[PDB]
Amino acid sequence: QLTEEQIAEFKEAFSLFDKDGDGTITTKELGTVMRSLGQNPTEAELQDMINEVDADGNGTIDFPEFLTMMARKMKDTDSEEEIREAFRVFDKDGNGFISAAELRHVMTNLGEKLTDEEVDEMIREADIDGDGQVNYEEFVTMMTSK
């Protein structure tokens, strides 16, 4: 039910959950990554969600199961509100632009390791209109870039 391009993009995102690259995720990594981006799932909420797609039943789900777990019957432009919510995770002060400091916070929450200048580089790259920050339009453009 996804494009080849969406599957590819989610595949790299899965590597942030699956740090040691064994191809499988447990309740622990699911929980850790969600909380680091400001969510608060219960252990039972995570288990119930995993059991629903865990074929083995060892409590360890793989990439295609990860995709299924994310799937649900969706309203028109619910996805669009999802993208706006993803943006608000970066735009912490809610003024509509992502700053260096804010990108750094997310990169840090997710365990990414980079230099202050690398963060600035990332800002510069997605900052089409050159006001020094990343707005929503630029965000989505970067997000769906080829």
Binding site: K11, E12, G21, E45, R72, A86, E112, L114, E121, M142
Partner: protein, 737 residues
């Protein structure tokens, strides 16, 4: 300038630099020289982690591991298991048994437990019975390795109960009637044993079942020098009480045609130990004696001789055989005269010549013993019955590929058996590679199978077996006429040649009609065909058959080349294959490190021969058709980060490898980025290594070109991860209201 591996008569291979000349640290044929691993000190748990996967690098790797007492190495999901020849401490510890539980293959070090856990895991998830196929010559550690699989399964997924120790108790009964001494092994198994551990609907152990196949019938009457009949015969003759010895009219085995002639063979003691084990099993003196009666009956049968008398032709029993005949008739519960008529005539009463009566005697002997073995395996199965089951996990043990200076029909059948098992081995490895590639997000592996060698043997009408049947059906069957028929019908066959073309001087004196060479998976075998026609015929005529079926002895009644030996062998081989094909399969290959049973000795050339006979060489060739080398991202991060700017070294292992390959412009045909590993076509890991070791400056340049891509990859990773988290949050709320 690269170190290659070249043939070495005693180590198989040695390092050095139509054919080629090699300097060690010597003329050699091109196709026997293999690329070596750069780091000779190195060691990997999966030989698919090497840059070159070939017989040489494989042999070198498991050697290195052997020294560190690392006896278990993988090739993909295939386990190589070299006999340590001493008890490596705590590796079969109960603790270790728990550390392997539910662990995916290759998250723990290589171990028979993992093979074992995987079978259970697939059984449980896929709801499909499983088979574990073990290979290996005598002294390879095959018996111990089987124990471990069973022990593991029972302590891990049994319920306190103890089926393994039960199977372990019952086994001495199988060995008595099913094993015999050979030229290469004093206690060789002569049938196919599929020891099944059965499971209930919730994947808990609930019983055992020993399936059995292809008992070697010819041994019952005839053996070669250095060989003996089945153990039981000699044990009984040397161990029975002076009483039993009298009732069954036993005596020295030298007094029975059916028993050819060794001090280390303790028949007296093994008989005592055997009875000891029989009692532990719940085998009372009654069925014990019932077993011994048939055994003796067959021994006396075999002593009945015949001669021509001129009796309005037909032959008769030598009067000297009168006693063997009454003894045999007595022990088999038959009328002495009925038996006599049915051994020297067939039913319209056709008299039989001497040879024909010899064959009637032997045919009866083979059928009776074979039904006795059937019964013996059934009683063993009663030592651990179950009511019902859903699936099983079975370990298959059966004589491996073999050749000698002289090969006859016995080797033919055995090697035919392994030719079909090898086809199965290849098919299932091919399947595993394909599913591995799909599972990793990457392809059909290039492989030509040995169907043609199988068809040479078993094809209808023109196959060797059917041409042999045809000969038996001719007025005066001839081995020579048979052999020529084989050559004339497979004119320009890839797989068949005349002995004159042998790669060995010992075979080139054999005439075209005295033999043939079959190019088997493991190598060419030259068969001498004298006696093929006689060995293809073991048929029991109906009247003699009726006789035994209607024995006064109730036990015997309960035991019960128109159809040739070759054809029955095929039929039985096919039943075993039917069973295997219904399961998911895994393979263990046991290796005998040397002859002397000694620790820390690695006979290169001798282990190499075993690798070949087990079909491992055949399997590596097959793997060259796909992606034979594969390495985790973390592993490649570790190896190569030092060659790249510090910028790349900051990335995580997956993104580091992504960046590397993007910057080198590595085509996506030869290099494949999976979910957990990078996969390489043959030669390509090595190529990638060279690139990595080339001019550091041009290298840092290529990275620059990738800078935009790298930044966009960094964004998309966290952006799509944020989106994932948001979908997971929306999913929890979905599942709620």
């Amino acid at each position: 300038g690269k170190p290659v591996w070249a043939p070495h008569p005693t180590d198989g291979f040695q390092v050095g630099n139509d054919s080629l000349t090699i300097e060690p640290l010597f003329l050699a044929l091109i196709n026997q020289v293999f690329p070596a691993e750069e780091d000779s000190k190195k060691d990997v748990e999966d030989n698919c982690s090497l840059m070159y996967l070939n017989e040489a690098t494989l042999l070198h790797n498991i050697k290195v591991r052997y020294s560190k007492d690392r006896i278990y190495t993988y090739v993909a999901n295939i386990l190589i298991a070299v006999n340590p020849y001493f008890d490596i401490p705590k590796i079969y510890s109960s603790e270790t048994i728990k550390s392997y539980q539910g662990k995916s293959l290759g998250t723990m070090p290589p171990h028979v437990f993992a093979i074992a856990d995987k079978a259970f895991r697939d059984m449980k998830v896929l709801k499909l019975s499983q088979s574990i196929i073990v290979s290996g010559e005598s002294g390879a550690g095959k018996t111990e390795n089987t124990k471990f699989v069973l022990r593991y399964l029972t302590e891990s997924y049994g319920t306190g109960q103890d089926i393994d120790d039960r199977i372990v108790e019952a086994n001495p009964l199988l060995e008595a009637f099913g094993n015999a001494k050979t030229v290469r092994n004093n206690n060789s198994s002569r049938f196919g044993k599929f020891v099944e551990i059965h499971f209930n609907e919730k994947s808990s152990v609930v019983g055992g079942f020993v399936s059995h196949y292809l008992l070697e019938k010819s041994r019952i009457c005839v053996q070669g020098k250095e060989e003996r009949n089945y153990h039981i015969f000699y044990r009984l003759c040397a161990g029975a009480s002076e009483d039993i010895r009298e009732r069954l009219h036993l005596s020295s085995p030298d007094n029975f045609r059916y028993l050819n002639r060794d001090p280390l063979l303790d028949d007296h003691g093994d008989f005592i130990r055997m009875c000891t084990a029989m009692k532990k099993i719940g085998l009372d003196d009654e069925e014990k004696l019932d077993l011994f009666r048939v055994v003796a009956g067959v021994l006396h049968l075999g002593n009945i001789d015949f001669e021509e008398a001129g009796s309005t032709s037909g032959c008769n029993l030598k009067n000297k055989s009168t006693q063997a005949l009454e003894y045999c008739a007595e022990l088999l519960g038959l009328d002495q005269d009925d038996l006599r008529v049915s051994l020297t005539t067939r039913v319209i009463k056709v008299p039989l010549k001497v040879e024909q009566a010899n064959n009637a005697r032997d045919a009866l002997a083979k059928t009776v013993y074979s039904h006795l073995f059937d019964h013996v395996v059934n009683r063993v199965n009663q030592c651990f019955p179950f009511e019902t089951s859903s699936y099983f996990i079975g370990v298959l043990d059966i004589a491996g590929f073999e050749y000698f200076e002289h090969n006859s029909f016995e080797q033919f059948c055995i090697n035919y058996c392994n030719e079909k098992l090898q086809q199965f081995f290849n098919e299932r490895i091919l399947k595993e590679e394909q599913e591995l590639y799909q599972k990793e997000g990457l392809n059909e592996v290039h492989y030509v199978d040995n169907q043609d060698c199988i068809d040479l043997i078993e094809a209808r009408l023109v196959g060797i077996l059917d041409i042999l049947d045809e000969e038996n059906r001719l007025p005066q069957p001839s081995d020579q006429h048979f052999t020529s028929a084989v050559h004339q019908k497979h004119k320009d066959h890839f797989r068949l040649s005349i002995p004159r073309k042998s790669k060995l001087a010992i075979h080139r004196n054999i005439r075209d009609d005295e033999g043939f060479i079959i190019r088997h998976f493991a190598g060419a075998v030259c068969y001498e065909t004298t006696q093929f026609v006689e060995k293809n015929n073991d048929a029991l005529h109906m009247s003699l058959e009726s006789l035994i079926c209607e024995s006064r002895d109730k036990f015997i009644r309960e035991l019960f080349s128109f159809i040739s030996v070759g054809n029955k062998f095929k039929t039985q081989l096919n039943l075993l294959l039917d069973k295997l094909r219904s399961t998911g399969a895994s393979f263990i290959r046991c290796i005998k490190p040397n002859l002397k049973m000694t620790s820390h000795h690695f006979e290169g050339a001798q282990i190499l021969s075993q690798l070949q006979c087990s079909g491992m060489v055949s399997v590596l060739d097959l793997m060259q058709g796909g992606f034979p080398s594969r390495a985790s991202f973390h592993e490649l991060y570790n190896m190569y980060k030092k060659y790249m700017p510090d910028k790349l070294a900051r990335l995580d292992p997956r993104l580091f490898c992504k960046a590397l390959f993007k910057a080198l412009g590595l085509n996506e045909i030869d290099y494949k980025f999976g979910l957990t590993k990078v996969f390489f076509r043959p030669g390509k890991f090595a190529e990638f290594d060279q690139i990595m070791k080339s001019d550091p400056d041009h290298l840092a340049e290529l990275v620059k070109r990738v800078n935009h891509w790298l930044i966009c990859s960094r964004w998309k990773k966290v952006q799509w991860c944020s989106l994932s988290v948001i979908k997971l949050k929306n999913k929890i709320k979905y599942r709620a209201e």
